[PDB]
Short mmCIF file of all heavy atoms in Angstrom, two decimals:
data_model
loop_
_atom_site.label_atom_id
_atom_site.label_comp_id
_atom_site.label_asym_id
_atom_site.label_seq_id
_atom_site.Cartn_x
_atom_site.Cartn_y
_atom_site.Cartn_z
N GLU U 32 0.82 -1.22 0.00
CA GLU U 32 0.00 0.00 0.00
C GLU U 32 0.85 1.27 0.00
O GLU U 32 1.92 1.31 0.63
CB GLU U 32 -0.92 0.05 1.23
CG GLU U 32 -1.79 -1.17 1.40
CD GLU U 32 -1.11 -2.22 2.30
OE1 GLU U 32 0.10 -2.05 2.61
OE2 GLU U 32 -1.78 -3.21 2.67
N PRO U 33 0.38 2.31 -0.69
CA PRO U 33 1.03 3.62 -0.62
C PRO U 33 0.82 4.25 0.75
O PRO U 33 -0.11 3.85 1.46
CB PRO U 33 0.31 4.43 -1.70
CG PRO U 33 -0.99 3.75 -1.88
CD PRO U 33 -0.74 2.31 -1.64
N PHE U 34 1.67 5.19 1.13
CA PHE U 34 1.54 5.80 2.45
C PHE U 34 1.43 7.31 2.27
O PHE U 34 2.22 7.92 1.56
CB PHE U 34 2.74 5.42 3.33
CG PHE U 34 2.78 6.15 4.65
CD1 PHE U 34 2.01 5.71 5.71
CD2 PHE U 34 3.60 7.25 4.85
CE1 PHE U 34 2.03 6.35 6.93
CE2 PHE U 34 3.64 7.90 6.07
CZ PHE U 34 2.85 7.44 7.12
N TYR U 35 0.42 7.89 2.91
CA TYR U 35 0.19 9.33 2.89
C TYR U 35 0.08 9.86 4.32
O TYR U 35 -0.46 9.19 5.20
CB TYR U 35 -1.09 9.67 2.11
CG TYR U 35 -1.11 9.23 0.66
CD1 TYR U 35 -1.56 7.96 0.28
CD2 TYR U 35 -0.70 10.10 -0.35
CE1 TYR U 35 -1.57 7.57 -1.07
CE2 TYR U 35 -0.71 9.73 -1.69
CZ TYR U 35 -1.14 8.47 -2.04
OH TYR U 35 -1.15 8.12 -3.38
N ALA U 36 0.64 11.04 4.56
CA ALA U 36 0.48 11.69 5.86
C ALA U 36 0.37 13.19 5.72
O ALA U 36 1.24 13.83 5.12
CB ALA U 36 1.64 11.34 6.78
N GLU U 37 -0.73 13.75 6.21
CA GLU U 37 -0.91 15.21 6.19
C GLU U 37 -0.51 15.83 7.52
O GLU U 37 -1.15 15.62 8.55
CB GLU U 37 -2.36 15.53 5.85
CG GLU U 37 -2.75 15.15 4.43
CD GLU U 37 -4.22 15.37 4.15
OE1 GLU U 37 -5.02 15.04 5.06
OE2 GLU U 37 -4.57 15.84 3.05
N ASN U 38 0.61 16.55 7.49
CA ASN U 38 1.13 17.27 8.64
C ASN U 38 1.49 18.72 8.26
O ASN U 38 0.62 19.49 7.84
CB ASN U 38 2.32 16.51 9.23
CG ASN U 38 1.88 15.22 9.92
OD1 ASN U 38 1.04 15.25 10.81
ND2 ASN U 38 2.44 14.08 9.50
N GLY U 39 2.78 19.05 8.27
CA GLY U 39 3.19 20.42 7.98
C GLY U 39 3.29 20.77 6.51
O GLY U 39 3.07 19.92 5.66
N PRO U 40 3.64 22.04 6.21
CA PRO U 40 3.71 22.63 4.87
C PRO U 40 4.92 22.23 4.04
O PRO U 40 5.07 22.69 2.91
CB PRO U 40 3.78 24.13 5.16
CG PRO U 40 4.44 24.21 6.51
CD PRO U 40 3.93 23.03 7.27
N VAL U 41 5.79 21.43 4.63
CA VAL U 41 6.94 20.86 3.95
C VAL U 41 6.68 19.39 3.67
O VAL U 41 6.37 18.62 4.58
CB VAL U 41 8.22 21.02 4.77
CG1 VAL U 41 9.41 20.56 3.96
CG2 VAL U 41 8.41 22.47 5.12
N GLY U 42 6.82 18.99 2.41
CA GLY U 42 6.48 17.64 2.01
C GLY U 42 7.66 16.82 1.54
O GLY U 42 8.65 17.36 1.02
N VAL U 43 7.58 15.51 1.75
CA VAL U 43 8.59 14.59 1.25
C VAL U 43 7.96 13.52 0.35
O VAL U 43 7.00 12.85 0.74
CB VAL U 43 9.34 13.89 2.40
CG1 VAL U 43 10.43 12.98 1.86
CG2 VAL U 43 9.93 14.91 3.36
N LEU U 44 8.49 13.38 -0.86
CA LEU U 44 8.04 12.31 -1.74
C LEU U 44 9.05 11.16 -1.70
O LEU U 44 10.24 11.36 -1.94
CB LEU U 44 7.91 12.85 -3.16
CG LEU U 44 7.45 11.91 -4.27
CD1 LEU U 44 6.05 11.40 -3.96
CD2 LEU U 44 7.47 12.65 -5.58
N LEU U 45 8.58 9.95 -1.43
CA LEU U 45 9.48 8.81 -1.34
C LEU U 45 9.17 7.82 -2.43
O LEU U 45 8.03 7.39 -2.60
CB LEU U 45 9.40 8.15 0.04
CG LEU U 45 9.74 8.98 1.27
CD1 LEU U 45 8.53 9.69 1.85
CD2 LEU U 45 10.41 8.09 2.30
N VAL U 46 10.20 7.44 -3.18
CA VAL U 46 10.03 6.60 -4.35
C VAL U 46 10.75 5.27 -4.20
O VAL U 46 11.96 5.24 -3.99
CB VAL U 46 10.54 7.30 -5.61
CG1 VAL U 46 10.06 6.56 -6.83
CG2 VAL U 46 10.03 8.74 -5.66
N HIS U 47 10.00 4.18 -4.34
CA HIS U 47 10.59 2.84 -4.24
C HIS U 47 11.17 2.40 -5.57
O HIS U 47 11.11 3.14 -6.56
CB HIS U 47 9.60 1.81 -3.69
CG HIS U 47 8.52 1.42 -4.65
ND1 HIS U 47 8.73 0.55 -5.70
CD2 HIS U 47 7.21 1.77 -4.71
CE1 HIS U 47 7.60 0.39 -6.38
NE2 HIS U 47 6.66 1.13 -5.80
N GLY U 48 11.70 1.18 -5.61
CA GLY U 48 12.46 0.73 -6.76
C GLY U 48 11.82 -0.31 -7.67
O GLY U 48 10.68 -0.74 -7.45
N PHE U 49 12.60 -0.69 -8.67
CA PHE U 49 12.26 -1.62 -9.75
C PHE U 49 11.96 -3.03 -9.20
O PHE U 49 12.81 -3.63 -8.54
CB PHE U 49 13.47 -1.65 -10.70
CG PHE U 49 13.31 -2.49 -11.91
CD1 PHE U 49 12.75 -1.97 -13.07
CD2 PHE U 49 13.74 -3.81 -11.91
CE1 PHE U 49 12.62 -2.75 -14.21
CE2 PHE U 49 13.61 -4.60 -13.03
CZ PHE U 49 13.05 -4.07 -14.19
N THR U 50 10.74 -3.51 -9.45
CA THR U 50 10.18 -4.76 -8.89
C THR U 50 9.86 -4.70 -7.40
O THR U 50 9.38 -5.68 -6.83
CB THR U 50 11.04 -6.04 -9.14
OG1 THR U 50 12.18 -6.05 -8.26
CG2 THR U 50 11.48 -6.16 -10.59
N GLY U 51 10.16 -3.58 -6.75
CA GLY U 51 9.91 -3.41 -5.33
C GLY U 51 8.52 -2.88 -4.99
O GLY U 51 7.65 -2.78 -5.85
N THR U 52 8.33 -2.49 -3.73
CA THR U 52 7.06 -1.95 -3.26
C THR U 52 7.35 -0.83 -2.28
O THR U 52 8.52 -0.60 -1.95
CB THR U 52 6.22 -3.03 -2.53
OG1 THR U 52 6.89 -3.39 -1.31
CG2 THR U 52 6.00 -4.27 -3.38
N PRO U 53 6.31 -0.09 -1.84
CA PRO U 53 6.50 0.91 -0.78
C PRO U 53 7.14 0.40 0.53
O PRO U 53 7.62 1.20 1.31
CB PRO U 53 5.07 1.37 -0.50
CG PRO U 53 4.41 1.27 -1.82
CD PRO U 53 5.00 0.05 -2.49
N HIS U 54 7.12 -0.90 0.75
CA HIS U 54 7.74 -1.50 1.93
C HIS U 54 9.17 -1.05 2.20
O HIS U 54 9.57 -0.87 3.35
CB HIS U 54 7.70 -3.02 1.80
CG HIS U 54 8.36 -3.75 2.92
ND1 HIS U 54 9.62 -4.29 2.80
CD2 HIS U 54 7.94 -4.07 4.17
CE1 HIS U 54 9.96 -4.90 3.92
NE2 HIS U 54 8.95 -4.78 4.77
N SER U 55 9.94 -0.93 1.14
CA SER U 55 11.34 -0.58 1.25
C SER U 55 11.54 0.87 1.73
O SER U 55 12.60 1.19 2.26
CB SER U 55 12.06 -0.85 -0.07
OG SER U 55 11.60 -0.01 -1.11
N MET U 56 10.56 1.74 1.50
CA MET U 56 10.70 3.15 1.88
C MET U 56 9.87 3.54 3.11
O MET U 56 10.02 4.63 3.64
CB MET U 56 10.32 4.05 0.70
CG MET U 56 11.14 3.80 -0.55
SD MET U 56 12.89 4.23 -0.39
CE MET U 56 12.78 6.01 -0.27
N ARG U 57 9.01 2.63 3.57
CA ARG U 57 8.10 2.94 4.68
C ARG U 57 8.73 3.45 6.00
O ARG U 57 8.25 4.43 6.57
CB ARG U 57 7.16 1.75 4.93
CG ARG U 57 5.84 2.15 5.57
CD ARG U 57 4.96 0.93 5.77
NE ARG U 57 4.57 0.28 4.52
CZ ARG U 57 3.59 0.70 3.74
NH1 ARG U 57 2.90 1.79 4.07
NH2 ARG U 57 3.29 0.04 2.61
#
């Protein structure tokens, strides 16, 4: 599953890899 969090006005985009999933960046 993708992960979203609404907090402050500064945002971070996290990108996983080839054949991978969001697990690696969670």
Side-chain angles (χ1 to χ4, degrees):
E32 306 92 350
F34 172 81
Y35 300 88
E37 293 175 318
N38 290 304
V41 187
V43 183
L44 180 62
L45 300 90
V46 193
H47 73 77
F49 183 88
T50 76
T52 67
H54 177 259
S55 66
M56 303 293 292
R57 206 179 296 280

